[PDB]
Amino acid sequence: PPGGGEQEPPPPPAPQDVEMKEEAATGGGSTGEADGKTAAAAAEHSQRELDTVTLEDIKEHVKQLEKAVSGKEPRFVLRALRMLPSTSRRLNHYVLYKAVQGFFTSNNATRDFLLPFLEEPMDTEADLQFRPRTGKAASTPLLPEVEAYLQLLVVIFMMNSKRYKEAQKISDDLMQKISTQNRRALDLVAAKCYYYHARVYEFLDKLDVVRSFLHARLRTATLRHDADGQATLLNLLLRNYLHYSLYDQAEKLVSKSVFPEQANNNEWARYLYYTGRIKAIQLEYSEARRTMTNALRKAPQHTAVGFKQTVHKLLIVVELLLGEIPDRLQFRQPSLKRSLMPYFLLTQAVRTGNLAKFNQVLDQFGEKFQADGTYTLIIRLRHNVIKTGVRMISLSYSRISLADIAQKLQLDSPEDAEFIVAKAIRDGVIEASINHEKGYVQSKEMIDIYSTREPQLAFHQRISFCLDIHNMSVKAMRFP
Amino acid sequence: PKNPDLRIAQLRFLLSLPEHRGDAAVRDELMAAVRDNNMAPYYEALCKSLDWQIDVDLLNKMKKANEDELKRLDEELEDAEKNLGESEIRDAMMAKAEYLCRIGDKEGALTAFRKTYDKTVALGHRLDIVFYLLRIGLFYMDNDLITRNTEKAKSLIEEGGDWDRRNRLKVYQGLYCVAIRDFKQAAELFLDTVSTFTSYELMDYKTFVTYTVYVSMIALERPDLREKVIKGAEILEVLHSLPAVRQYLFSLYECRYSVFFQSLAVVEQEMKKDWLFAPHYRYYVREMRIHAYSQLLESYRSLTLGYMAEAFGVGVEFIDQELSRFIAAGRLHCKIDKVNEIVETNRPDSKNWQYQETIKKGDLLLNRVQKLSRVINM
Amino acid sequence: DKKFHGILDQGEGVLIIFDEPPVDKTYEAALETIQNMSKVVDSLYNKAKKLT
């Protein structure tokens, strides 16, 4: 109290000022675009959503005593804003209570009285026309309600307060959102609730009841029309079925909802991560590793985040299922030091013809493979242990005898080495052919019509992509 | 002093990592260490070399007497005589700083350096201090010292004085040889070879000729290698002295490949006795072998490797296994063959090389405007 | 040493003489504009980062 109690006055008041003016400017500007210019996608909706991911989760977790976030619940406990006098009188309540909470101590909820301080926000003549104000300022106290991390009897208060919001969410969907379309906000509201509602149904029984809801939730989305609604709910619906270690993937193979068609550079990158894992488990390796490559190079804009290290984690496996491997640890991190050592030493043993080391480091680092969820490499990469060399030989040599490839693959038998070469050309590993007359295995022909016939079949996409940039530029040009 | 000082850092390395190389290096280092009153930096070497010997206390009272002789010199100087800058207080207090590089460790020397740099206005004396940081940072290969004071040399100093920067033109690319820039920058600014006085700023001349000729044949093969190192005159004087280096040159240019490897194996074995050595020895030979293969497979489109069995060396299977590693490496653009035993090559054309470049530069800019079109418009 | 337009064979011991097209001037100057187009997009994204 002379040490820390004297350093108690500095933490409230500037978060009582500039963090308070955050949602004051957000709630004012979202209302300003909900009223006029009803196409309200281009506002601080996006940056506040980037803030509610980043800023206000780490701006405050606890309600920040001496009334910075502790005051937010008795501040917004009395919100009518109903008619023009009921707006102007609540504008006086925006003046008086922020002066009291800036001066003295108001009604401090002791972390369990937060839900009755979510009743009179829903009560006290609250409106339906201010449905962004109800939707945002109810979901934004749910993150101190979940990231308190005590997880005891607030978990059911998590369960109640989300279904409080989701009853307002569904009723807004039933009661006809005139010219606002909160779905642009309610998509990641439906995400942020169901990230931790998935955690709650991991701390309790299964979340197929969420999927039965989310099927009906995906039904009312995009039957109206899609405004990021099909994009968010599909990665939410796909994640549980991928999280369950049951069969679950041919359900996703028949999932013919593969058009989100735009995702603001963030849903599409992780969507390509999930479906790249799906096409990898049904053994289609070529299309998988190129859309896993597309997912890695689309949204890496972070600072050593980890899921970027997870899409980099699965990408090296399917490339070891087709032979090639680049430099991996050239972007080493304080946490990548843990996760570089198994995989770099894995492809170390794959490139050489050593299998005793390959079985040893399986035994050495299998428990790390248990944490990554990749048991299946031992049953399906021992295929490519013998197939990496025959890909390497047939790229090097041009017209080889099968009697010499037996010692070069150290197989010590020419009679079955015909069949390994037969299986690789059956799988399309190498395009080469075999002369079964005197033992010749010759490669392909020279560089083909590639200089003449091909390049327009690359040029057609680049015309069509660049003029659509010109089209999307011109159409979205003039707002004034 | 500090003028022949970099021979010590050679004998630190040459004694340490090859323990079999431990006969004559210890014989002329320890006697050289009891010379010049070298007392601080050898305790690490005394752990790795022979155990202990008590002349430490004898030279400690010698290193304290010379410290105290200069201690009473410059405290009386700073308390009686009050003209400063590059004055008598300056060169006495740098004689402390020169004492702590010659005898002491870096820590007392660097804090005397950063103190005396904040006092002076003549940038020549400022640049001489930066010359002293760059040398002690080259001793202990401190990569964080050298990134600072080279920026001090380029930006903060050298807008003025002139042609003492050519001393650093030997240093900026001497640091590029200890990095992996064994390719183009080191060969580019070692090309001005006219600084011959074997000084501290020009640490040696004949080894500098061997350094600028080893790095030169990787920057350029025939975009006129022959003008700068073969038609060059003052470079040709000193390689007329050294018989093996000129033999190592003209084997490559006049295309005698059998004697080229006999020279190259001597170079790699002579490479082992270097102190900026860690990126050389695995990477230099493997680059020069595929360097000679590219010009040999050039001018031919149908080579039998039995012609490479005697016009090249020996070992039919040895060429076979080394080409197979290089073709699989994504380099050495040809196709090796069995029982016809004819190495067949392939190269791109006008259309094939210009399309392979535009297919990559196009996709890089296309991916670049994917992101840029989505940063704007929400 | 480019004093000649040819190639050799060891499988037949044969000298072969050919010609080459000088008409690379279109494709040479084609991708040099991409270097100019690379620098302007780097400049625009710098301008767009400066203000939203």
Partner: peptide
């Protein structure tokens, strides 16, 4: 590669020049 790229990049200039002139005239209206 010449006519599809440059036509797209020039119209992309007209976006940033308009999006600057949109909101910097909007924030100075009040």
């Amino acid at each position: 590669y010449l006519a599809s790229l440059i036509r797209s990049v020039v119209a992309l200039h007209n976006l940033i020049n308009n999006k600057i002139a949109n909101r910097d005239a909007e924030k100075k209206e009040g």
